[PDB]
């Protein structure tokens, strides 16, 4: 399957005093591998996976230097965006950036990403061709003019199609025994009597990686969305994920219902039925 590398950057201005709070996280697929937080003591890019620990102290020097230049760029942005939107200094405000590359199952360049939001709303994003920009409003149109002038898109394209892709490959190779493994979900079904005539079947997917999954209920071979409830897929806290889906059914009719589970780690889709 495909793989992604992504970085996520959040900066929250502190109006009373001092510079903005800045947090950066790096991910390979659904696995966080690095981070920086401006309010931590180390003031360094820190490892969050055991496999990135094998990088030498130059790597940590280079990634610390870069991530600090990143927080300064976002510090300067908060102040430009305050003026652009003509906002006061009493208000806290937030910028978020995300960038990265996706590779297919041959690990070649598939797709690149660089997006930027202000106060939780789109501001500017690199289009999927990587040579032009989507600006959401006129302030962002001003930024787009400046970045066209200074050939920014083209630097990004070198990074997204080149550096990002080569470092992704290298991580997949050094985190191999976790990143290139896929953990199929451990599934089961529970029953709970609502009342004397209604019953609830809940289908569980536990312990799976990566996070993408689908759970579908059927009745007598047909999709059923009515009288069901999905939960958002949630992290277990040990690198794996969970999710469940449930359906309310009339008592005695449990065996009409089947739960179907699809996941990259399951050669074929799985089918659960209450009746043992």
């Amino acid at each position: 399957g495909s793989h992604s590398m992504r970085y996520f950057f959040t900066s929250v201005s502190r109006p009373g005093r001092g510079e903005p709070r800045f947090i950066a996280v790096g991910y390979v697929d659904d696995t966080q591998f690095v981070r920086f937080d401006s309010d931590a003591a180390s003031q360094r890019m820190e490892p969050r996976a055991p496999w990135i620990e094998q990088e030498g102290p130059e790597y940590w020097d280079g990634e610390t230097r870069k991530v600090k230049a990143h927080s300064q760029t976002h510090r300067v942005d908060l102040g430009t965006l305050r003026g652009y939107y003509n906002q006061s200094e009493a208000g806290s405000h937030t910028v978020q950036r995300m960038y990265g590359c996706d590779v297919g199952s041959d690990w070649r360049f598939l797709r690149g990403y660089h997006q930027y939001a202000y106060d939780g709303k789109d501001y500017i994003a690199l289009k999927e061709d990587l040579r032009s920009w989507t600006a959401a409003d006129m302030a962002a149109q001003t930024t787009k003019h400046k970045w066209e002038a200074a050939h920014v898109a083209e630097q990004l394209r070198a990074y997204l199609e080149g550096t990002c892709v080569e470092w992704l490959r290298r991580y997949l190779e050094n985190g191999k025994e976790t990143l290139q493994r896929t953990d199929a979900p451990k599934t089961h079904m529970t029953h709970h009597a609502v009342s004397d005539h209604e019953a609830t079947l809940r289908c569980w997917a536990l312990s799976f990686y990566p996070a993408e999954i689908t759970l579908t209920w059927q009745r007598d071979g047909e999709d059923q969305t009515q009288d069901t409830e999905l939960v958002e897929t949630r992290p277990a806290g040990d690198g794996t994920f969970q999710k469940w889906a449930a359906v309310v059914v009339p008592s005695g009719q449990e065996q009409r219902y089947t739960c179907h589970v699809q996941h990259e780690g399951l050669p074929k889709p799985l089918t659960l039925r209450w009746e043992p």
Partner: peptide, 9 residues
Amino acid sequence: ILAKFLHTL
């Protein structure tokens, strides 16, 4: 690894 430069808006 991170991008080498990040331009101000």
